[PDB]
Design a protein around this ligand. Structure first.
Ligand SMILES: [Mg+2]
Ligand SMILES: [Mg+2]
Ligand SMILES: [Mg+2]
Ligand SMILES: [Mg+2]
Ligand SMILES: [Mg+2]
Ligand SMILES: [Mg+2]
Ligand SMILES: [Mg+2]
Ligand SMILES: [Mg+2]
Ligand SMILES: [Zn+2]
Lengths: 108, 217, 152, 115, 304
RNA sequence: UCUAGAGUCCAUAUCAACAAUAGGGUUUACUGGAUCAGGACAUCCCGAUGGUGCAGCCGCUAUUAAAGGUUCGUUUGUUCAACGAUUAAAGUCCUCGUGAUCUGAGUUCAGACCGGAGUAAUCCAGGUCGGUUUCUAUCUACUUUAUUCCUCCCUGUACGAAAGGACAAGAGAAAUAAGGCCUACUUCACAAAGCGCCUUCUAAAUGAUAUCAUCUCAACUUAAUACCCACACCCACCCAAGAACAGGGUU
RNA sequence: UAAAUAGGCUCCACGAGGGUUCAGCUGUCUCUUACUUUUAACCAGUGAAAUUGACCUGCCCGUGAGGCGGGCAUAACACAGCAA
């Protein structure tokens, strides 16, 4: 059907500003104790995750530049090595994806 | 190494303790009556006690068309034709009325559920009541009978040609025209056999069940 | 009523669900780490685990080969499954994938999730460590370790 | 489930029935408060343009465990005062008629086979 | 502020705390197994018109069980887990009705409870239970808090009442909820198949309170009366109660003696205050059976 | 209400004529069905009691009783009626009760035909076939308050003029209603369901006004428990809990 | 048909014309049930329209009805349903 009467600003305020409709204050924010950026407990530090995705993208660009075209999933493991890092004794027989910047401190 | 399907429990959330008590009671029932090994398709003769008589014994011989259930109640259906009338009876194994169960002819057919016999011609389900057993070599695989069957013509009771039944014991090329096998195959579901997460892996369960069954001796 | 139904409903039906999960799983096997909506990744985790289980049986088995044929779409990955992933987890008997939640998607504000196969070459996800063992509460609990061990 | 408007095949040698007629016997009423009829529930039949009392002796509907599940809705014609009209029965009748009270003693003295 | 127990513990500390609290729970559970070497209360002989505490069981599942007369009887399995009498309230502390006992069941974690409940259980020397329920008993049926209760509390041959939370169907329309013959299908019944008809008559400009309408279903406590007990498993503490019992599996139900006015007597031969396994009165076998159960291991029945 | 007339004798076992005292309508000539139902009792059944010409179950009337129930079909639609099978019964009415819940017929929508009236157009409180009423809920209100039947003992006692044939008390079996479950069957398959299963608690005694008597608008004495039940958390995950929020579990 | 107000100038062929009947078929029904998709409910973006005297918008009985009278009830507030 249709309304029988306009609804006043008072009723509309008792509806719109009722607590159930308010935005709740979040009790689960904190500071990355080492890195020092904001984060929720159960979620990754956004800044750290972005700085990881950047390096993943650069590595993957090198991988694409080396594999040539599509349909070339290798049949061996892969290892990524930064400048001035000779292939360790454990990484022989694994594809090497050379990169041209110093290894990040967070890359172990 | 054949573990009767009853002891394998349905996937669920019931408490293991329930199944342990179930199996304890069952095995305690298997030592007063020999519950033989019979697959769906076998021929059995079941001897029970008449409750409505004054202590008479009743014998019925038929083909095990379906074997379902679990725990202390699981059952099997025996189909037969007597005087041209097609009867079935659903017998509970662990019931304290079944006196004995003779495996009169241990067989095993292409499909694990011989329900379509309700539609096959009457002679594919007829058996002689007073028919003697047949021996079998101990270290022999259970024979796999191959008998495809011929159906009563038009109104099948449960529309067997669908893929979801996966029946392989019916002569479809005869009773169904080639066209009807193209409309009855748009329901194929090619993704249902490759769904890795619907597979109930029951190796680690049947192993412990065997430990229990053998230890109960 | 939906008591005891473990499978999400997504896509345009059951088939599209299997196909969506198949594309997610193929991306995972190809790159070893993918960011996808949280619920879809949680549905695909079980399939990725069981795919590694099937891949351990090895090429020679035919059932595993058919399964990996269905569940991998660019077939260059089937070698990998049977020669880089399944060999890699010859020791672990479970839990080959780690799944995290990440900042919600910018456009549609969906609940995201990064899922990866343990042990890959990629830079490591910023996992959340627990509190250092030298914190006050941990030190008191360490004292209790000692004092309870000596008594017992 | 032998309810109103269900075809039942008379199996009693049916001095009356068993003769050709373009209709087939139909149940027009079940002598139970609810419509459904199970074994032993004596019903009313329209057979050969006539109304005759009946007695169900088998049905395709699954019952309890240890009782037979036939594949045809079998009925025996009974006269109003309980006497069976026929003199024989060939199709097997279940042994579950010696149970719960009713006019069943005569119908077992006239059959020949059980299950 | 806001936090859970093992948020700040370190990697090598969570297993230790788990083991320590589990060991303490087991120790406290074991340190109550003998309630007569502790200080019991008076044990009066039963007399007519008395009521005795009941149990908090857990619903396992169902099974059949036959009888010498040849019939079938489904039954439900009830496992008594950690049933301890937790509290006592006096006759006129409830202001006239009766004396009351508070019995708890199904031990639960201790990191997931409110501070008050942990304080209560700490002063009582037990680990927290899941459900606490209040039984109305006479004065002479009192049991000291801290004593355990065991499936042998009952005996076959009696009747018993069971109360639990039904299964929650959620929000339900009117035919799944009240058995309403909805409106027919085709013949043109557009956009009305499973709908309520007229909610109320026309002269009254209101719908009565207590009108049957869509809404939440189940998930309310309810009681089944008259259930008989066939078997008791005194080694695993199972009760085999006839018929079906509300609730789902693994949910706690409240069991007490039948209150119907045909079983008011026959509370005599039962162990009155409770069953104490330490009484040492011809220790009970593994399975107690009713007079009319075709128990396993017996010859197959015959009707001659 | 007078019985007055009858009824094999006799008003009261039945009709009970006229009239009187009561509650209620009569418009044409010179609106059903489905769905859900709320309510009254002027009760159809079940329950309790009186008399009987029922010598007895049942019948007949009379008082009391509204907690519960009050079937399925063929033909047809001023809405009824007839008919078949049943049933313990297929009650009489108010709120079409109920069309922002759904449907049909109509009566009054344009098409066409038949019959009557008319010079014709057209009419006809006639008969046929066909034929479109849309709604996103603002406000109120509301959304968790065990009966019957059959069978059998008890048996064919009393009652009874022969003949027929009781209570009180129990025991089985079925259905329905409410409530709940998934061990089996069934549709199906980590579960939801039913066709399945379980539970349901006005005749006397003493006796005055009126010393006998009298049942007393005389005094006076007799013929439901159960269910729920912990002040203070909530980030995350799981759930037999769930629309969101809530609720159970995380040892 | 168990039961019936229904059906039963000649003139082949034809009819999305009207009425009736046999046999089958089927969830039309006895009597509903499960699953899937859209809708749905929640989060995020964009964002209408009929309607609207004012409203601080209860129930029962009476008058002639949320608003009058006489009784009763009554802390405020969302969200999803229903249609008296
Ligand atoms: Mg069928
Ligand atoms: Mg979707
Ligand atoms: Mg529709
Ligand atoms: Mg179903
Ligand atoms: Mg035409
Ligand atoms: Mg929005
Ligand atoms: Mg009014
Ligand atoms: Mg609202
Ligand atoms: Zn960080």
């Amino acid at each position: 059907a249709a309304p029988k009467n306009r609804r006043t600003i008072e009723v509309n305020r008792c509806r719109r500003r009722n607590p159930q409709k308010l935005i709740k204050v979040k009790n689960n924010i904190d500071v990355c104790p080492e890195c020092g950026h904001l984060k929720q407990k159960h979620v990754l530090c956004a800044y750290c995750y972005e700085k990881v995705c950047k390096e993943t993208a650069e590595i993957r660009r090198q991988i694409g530049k080396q594999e040539g075209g599509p349909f070339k999933a290798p049949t061996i493991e892969t290892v990524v090595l930064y400048t001035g890092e000779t292939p360790s004794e454990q990484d022989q027989g694994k594809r090497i994806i050379e990169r041209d910047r110093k290894r990040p401190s967070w890359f172990t | 190494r054949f573990l009767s399907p009853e002891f394998i429990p349905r996937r669920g959330r019931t408490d293991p303790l329930k199944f342990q008590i179930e199996r304890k009671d069952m095995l305690e029932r298997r030592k007063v009556l020999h519950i033989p090994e019979f697959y769906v398709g076998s021929i059995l003769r079941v001897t029970t006690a008449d409750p409505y008589a004054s202590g008479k014994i009743s014998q019925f011989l038929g083909i095990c068309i379906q074997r379902s259930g679990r725990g202390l109640g699981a059952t099997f259906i025996l189909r037969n034709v007597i005087e041209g009338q097609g009867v079935e009876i659903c017998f509970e194994l662990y019931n304290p009325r079944v006196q004995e169960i003779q495996v009169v002819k241990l067989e095993k057919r292409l499909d694990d559920s011989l329900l379509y016999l309700r539609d096959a011609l009457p002679e594919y389900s007829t058996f002689d009541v007073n028919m003697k057993p047949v021996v079998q070599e101990p270290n022999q695989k259970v024979p796999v009978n191959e008998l495809k069957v011929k159906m009563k013509p038009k109104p099948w009771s449960k529309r067997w040609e669908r893929p979801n039944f996966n029946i392989k014991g019916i002569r479809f090329d005869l009773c169904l025209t080639e066209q009807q096998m193209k409309e009855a195959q748009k329901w194929n579901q090619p993704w249902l056999e490759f769904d890795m997460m619907r597979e109930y892996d029951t190796s680690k369960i049947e192993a412990a069940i065997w430990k229990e069954i053998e230890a109960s001796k | 009523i939906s008591h005891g139904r473990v499978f999400r409903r997504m896509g345009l039906g059951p088939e599209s669900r299997i196909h969506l999960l198949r594309n997610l799983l193929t991306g995972l096997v190809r790159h070893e780490r993918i960011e996808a909506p949280w619920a879809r990744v949680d549905e695909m985790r079980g399939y990725a685990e069981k795919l590694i289980d099937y891949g351990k049986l090895g090429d020679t088995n035919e059932r595993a080969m058919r399964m990996a044929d269905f569940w991998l779409t660019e077939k260059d990955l089937i070698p990998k499954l049977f020669q880089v992933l399944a060999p890699r987890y010859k020791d672990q008997t479970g839990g080959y994938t780690r799944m995290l939640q990440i900042p919600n998607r910018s456009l549609d504000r969906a609940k995201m999730a990064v899922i990866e196969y343990k042990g890959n070459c990629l830079p490591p996800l910023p996992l959340p460590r627990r509190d250092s063992h030298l914190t006050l509460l941990n030190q008191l609990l360490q004292g209790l370790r000692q004092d309870l061990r000596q008594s017992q | 489930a032998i309810q109103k408007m269900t075809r039942v095949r008379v199996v009693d040698n049916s001095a009356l029935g068993n003769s050709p007629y373009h209709r087939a016997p139909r149940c027009i009423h079940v002598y139970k408060k609810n419509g459904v009829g199970k074994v032993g529930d004596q019903i009313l039949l329209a057979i050969k343009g006539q109304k005759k009392k009946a007695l169900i002796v088998g049905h395709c509907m699954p019952g309890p465990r240890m009782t037979p599940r036939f594949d045809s809705n079998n009925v025996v014609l009974i006269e109003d005062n309980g006497n069976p009209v026929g003199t024989r029965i060939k199709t097997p009748i279940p042994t579950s008629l010696r149970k719960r009270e009713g006019e069943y003693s005569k119908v077992l003295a006239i059959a020949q086979n059980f299950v | 502020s806001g936090t859970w127990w093992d948020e700040h513990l370190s990697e090598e500390n969570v297993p230790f705390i788990k083991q320590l609290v589990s060991d303490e729970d087991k120790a406290q559970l074991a340190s109550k197994l003998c309630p007569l070497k502790d200080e019991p209360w008076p044990i009066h002989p039963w007399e007519p018109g008395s009521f005795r505490v009941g149990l908090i069981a857990l619903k396992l599942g169902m099974m059949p069980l036959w009888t010498k007369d040849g019939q079938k009887h489904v039954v439900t399995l009830l496992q008594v887990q950690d049933c301890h009498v937790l509290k006592y309230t006096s006759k006129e502390n409830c202001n006239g009705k009766m004396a009351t006992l508070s019995v708890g069941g199904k031990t639960v974690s201790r990191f997931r409870k409110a501070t008050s409940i942990l304080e209560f259980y700490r002063e009582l020397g037990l680990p927290p239970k899941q459900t606490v329920k209040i039984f109305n008993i006479t004065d002479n049926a009192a049991i000291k808090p801290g004593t355990p209760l065991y499936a042998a509390h009952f005996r076959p041959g009696q009747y018993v009442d069971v109360t639990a939370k039904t299964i929650g169907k959620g929000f339900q329309g009117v035919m799944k909820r009240w058995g309403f013959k909805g409106q027919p299908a085709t013949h043109g019944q557009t956009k009305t198949h499973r709908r309520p008809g007229a909610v109320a008559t026309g002269d009254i400009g209101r719908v009565w309170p207590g009108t049957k309408m869509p809404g939440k279903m189940g998930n309310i406590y309810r009681t089944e009366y008259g259930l008989k007990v066939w078997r008791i498993n005194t080694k695993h503490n199972i009760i085999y109660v006839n018929g079906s019992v509300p609730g789902h599996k693994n949910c706690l139900v409240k069991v007490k003696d039948s209150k119907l006015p045909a079983y008011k007597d026959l509370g005599k031969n039962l162990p009155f205050p409770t069953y104490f396994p330490d009484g040492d009165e011809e220790e009970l076998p593994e399975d107690l059976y009713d007079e009319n159960v075709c128990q396993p291991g017996a010859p197959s029945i015959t009707f001659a």
